[model samples]
Target: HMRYSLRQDIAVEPVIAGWYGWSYLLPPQTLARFVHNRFNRIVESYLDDPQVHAAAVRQRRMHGGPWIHAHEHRDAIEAWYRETAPRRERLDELFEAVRRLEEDILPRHHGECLDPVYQELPAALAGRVEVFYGRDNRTADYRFVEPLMYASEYYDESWQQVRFRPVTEDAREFALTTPMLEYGPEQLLVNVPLNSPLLDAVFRGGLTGTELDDLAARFGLDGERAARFASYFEPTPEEDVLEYVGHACVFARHRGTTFLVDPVLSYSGYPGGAENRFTFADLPERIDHLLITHNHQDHMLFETLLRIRHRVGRVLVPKSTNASLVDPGLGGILRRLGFTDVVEVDDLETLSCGSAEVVALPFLGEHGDLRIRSKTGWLIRFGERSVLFAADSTNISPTMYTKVAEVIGPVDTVFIGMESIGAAASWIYGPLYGEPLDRRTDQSRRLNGSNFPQAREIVDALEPDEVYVYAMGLEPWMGVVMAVDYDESHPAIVDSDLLVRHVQDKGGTAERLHLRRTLRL
Candidate 1:
């Protein structure tokens, strides 16, 4: 049960939605899983490789000798991650494999047959995607399995009714249209920069302050390393407070109306910034609502959140994170920060504001303790018009989609994340899933969450008004793998096209747009 009534004037109407993007390319979960699986398998497979066997034997015999230093040996443990390793490019292979599934395999996997409709938009739009609120049940391999954007219908008074789609689906159906007036952004998207733990340390002169020391002790940091970045971490330099990397991404609103999720300025990982120095922007105007999807570093900036309490009237977030947000230790801090109200959400829950009622769509799969219990997607209902904001979700599981369909029903506009497919891997989740089996049967693919086709199926299933794809690309802040050349495997351009085609196959309209741009509804 979600606690809905937190503010009197603001009516809380729970809806369902999901969001992510290709721009934020690196998905931590996939990489983590890949790393974990590769390492474990390397341990077992090394015995089979004579070179590896000899190396291990030599390492054992040498004991502490220079034959293989502990660090190099550690690199051996990380051999699976290296490009030179036997199965080094597992992530790339997995991605291509998933693409094969969506383009070739998965259509047969599901009982339904796919009649792909094709729309050929100008190549100028390539690599350009708009953000929608949706989800995908497929793994990173099948990009856009769950996306923020979706499809819609267009009834031109002069031309009667015509459809649009990606070229790959049904190229014959789509017609290239000349621009009467250039398309522009109907919405405003303010980006919140991810907290740089290293940058924060550098700017702070070394983390020696009491707040940092306490944080270090709590999170198990040593005293010396904590003391190194002192000036930037301490309270004496009050002006430098907001300068911290953690405080940059709060209240990233689009057009002064749509308040983004978990707006914060200071990267809340460290104590000095995460704790006392709350620097959320103070907007005098009414902030529709603060949508905090889940409790992740980039998503949930505690200190900055505390600062914006007064400006931001209401806070809507997953129910599971409530305890931590309002913990006895943190409650007073929140109260002081000016958050007079709080709303807890469950899967497929909806909350209302103005003409729009934000729907919270819960994604399937477990991300362990690193993430909050309910990762949400939002269906913002504005009058007869509505837009979907699919938060960070994996797999458009049938149950999850059903709930989304029930809550959002049919939206006038959609935003989906076709990016972040290949980058999803992490330490905790990696161990359990094991390694990828390229030679594995469908059973094995199922076990590895080979549902990349789910995103397309979702677009076909929901059938919205007009789908504008966006939020694809990994942010450097998420992780190392994501920060690297994530584009090589999951080319941003191709991923966008695939999404458009899937919707077309269902006889729906889908559009891909450039970032920081908007399309008319």
Candidate 2:
């Protein structure tokens, strides 16, 4: 029996309800909202007019629109919609139950004992809610019995799937609002959960030219399916090196130790190979530390994290305040996804495990002004160099970084993002709320990072010799998440350009990073 290794650039994604699943879609309450409100609404809208959706998707303004990608295939759309009825009913009930508790039941008690109304709770929220009043006693609210809800039937693993999505140059449509129905040629869909060992087999097989006959039998691939799967592999091993993988991903090597920051793994086999950019082919054989800056899907990609779990020595994630609606503990989520020895770090926590001192600095903003505690800015000290990776961190307070610089004196190089104007809060956080936020309010709270002024503040505080503005999704392959079709005149581009020029004129080297670059000078 011959052994063949998986190709260096085969795109693997873990999806839920036919969309890329993220941390937000993991919890029972959150998933229920996504299903009832977001998915159901999108399906209804798409089924109403597929032509409108197809047209809208073509336009640049609708990059992150609430339209489905499978609009052209009405039959597939209908089929998936029809099938979701049973699950949809349950999700609707879950959402409605919470709404009733907050709106109907909670209001009935005014500075009175809340215990008596426990009997009046909705059946959907029977075991999952704890109805109570705030410290003021006049106001009423509820908290989720999150752990119990996870154990219940609400958290369904059947909705999970692993897809071997082939990648070209990443012009793929935004998947957060779209559902992929019909699996065509060059796509392998594994009907399994995120924690399935089959994924481990496939991912592990990519590095080692291992087995195929065993895999072919297990996933029921024969004939064309089997041959098509074979095309995503090679007999020879892929050589490696990386400076920037894409978007927020930055691979740094120092003292024989490798660090992968905000790893959003991309493809190398795409026509140009790694000439214009670094791809999965250039990654180190084994990662010493995988540092994640926040709980956002782009930063804490389950696709890359789950695949490289075995190869990575330590996975460092943000340790947010325990079970809140928005900020779930990333370490706990990783553990649930079958990752062992996960590290959940807090602000200012330093990992001295390796030759490099990996420090977790306080990350601010880009969270829609919510009480989310998952974001973190990373600071690395190695080889007589201090490098800061501030991925999508909005400099809301310059004084905070000034305080941080005081703790760890001056940085040699600083990387920051200038995507100041981003998607509204409703895009990601709409489903989480019991009541809908008005359009005006939603527009105000955007998922934004630093502006020119904010970014300038960081340069002022750190006084770094070199500054690079990045994570604005400039790479062509960033279509999956960072689908912004930006022109030179776009605010992010203009502001980042302003900051870059400012640093340059001040006798410091600065550039807005793109595609790929060397980590070392």
Candidate 3:
């Protein structure tokens, strides 16, 4: 029997399934049948109690008063169950079809590099792609399929490469973001396709400048690289310099040491104007240390990490305590990628990188309270200036920030997220099914990041001299993943401006940083 908590309930099983099911020796069809039966049994047991209906009625009256929708809780639960009931069969079918083909062909190519293999791949191997791609799957010619497969497999041989999509009848209305399967350190290979152009290039081979741009366009990377001179800047030796590079990326320099915070130069392999401020070519040949605040795909992108991997002296990631299934931790991922110096630190812990002192701060709200503990903000003190990198934090616990600010004293500058409204839990965790309760209202309140007032509270608590609203959807290319288009009138952007005005009125300098602008403190 599966131990199910009423809070997360059956939602946690898919994560376990994805993590374990990939390597299970049993056939997919068998596993799928077992899962379906198990889930229905659990549902049946939970609803068997007559008091289940009574409690739901009492809960609805307590929450909605006399205007309570009759059996809202019961109806939502049964609706969700009915909607998800057929996924078991579909999952079984998907796994059976994909694994059969994999077992047939994968053994021969296990350790073989694709560089030579692609030059003369058989038409039979190329034709099999038709099973995975076409119509709703987007079919491609053998010429395209062969190169694409070779290019994909060149890096990770075990990469499934096949996009496991559901047909209309079984298509999931919600997003089912699966967790990575467990693999031995030596056996580590990304299961998903190369979603980033630069990451794809690193795996396949370098692309021409035009080819890079064209590839970016084809994949909706849609933006120009920042012109080299456009982000030009110079600062005095004694002053600390901070360069804004869109999203959560910021370049910080103090004395002789240089550190980058969540260095995302491009969005979905598309270079924004921020890319011009300091391209991969312009990054200092020897960076004293690299400080990554967290491991959200946007914050710790593999495409961006590959560019400066060699130049970094050390990489510091937040140490997750009582780690959860959803997170394998960034240190493990970076080490698997072949970095020799990866360190994990906890909240309030301090470390030295060249002339700077980094203090890890407590960050809350991004994890959806799912027991996933892999997010943090950073406080870097260099000489006299202290800068806070609040990456997409929503201040679920303002006391943590207040206490840290008391210890750190007045910060010289603060770089924080203004993208307050976040997505629904199912928006990211669709694979794990649960009854939707007040979903529209709950989604609005449970937004992962801070709203305008929340941002103000964080700013008021931190009390920095200069504040830069970051992690807002300013760059157009980020729209590919963020689903938010660049708009001057965006509520986040407009409210951020209001924050700046509020700060200025209170005798502090505040402004939103553009792509390549530099601030000297």
TM value for model 3: 0.55
**lDDT of every predicted structure (CA atoms):** 0.36, 0.76, 0.52
Candidate 3 local lDDT, 320-408, one digit each (tens): 64321234445655654446798888887899778878888888886566655677788888877788888887767757678877876
Per residue, candidate 1 scores C-alpha lDDT tens digits across 72-144 of 2334344422423433243345434333433554443332222221122112111222212124432212222
Give candidate 1's total backbone clashes: 111
Query: How much lDDT does candidate 2 score?
Result: 0.76
Model 2: per-residue Cα lDDT over 1-521, one tens digit each: 44567676677777876677788777766777777777888888888888888898888777777877666688877887798788777766777877788788888888888887688998877866776678888887777776676777777888787777667664555677777543576787766778777667777774432367567657677777767766777775522233766778888776677889988776666674446556566666888888888887667777777777767888887776446566666776776677777788888988874677888888888989987888788888874788889998867875998898898898998888888887887777777776777778778988999999999988889899989887887666566665657789898889988999999989999988877787552
Question: How does candidate 3 score on lDDT?
Answer: 0.52
Clashes of 3: 2
User: Candidate 3: misplaced stretches above 4 Å?
Assistant: 1-157, 160-240, 267-276, 432-445
Task: Give the candidate number with the greatest lDDT.
Answer: 2
Considering summed lDDT, which 10 consecutive residues are worst modelled in model 3?
Answer: 4-13
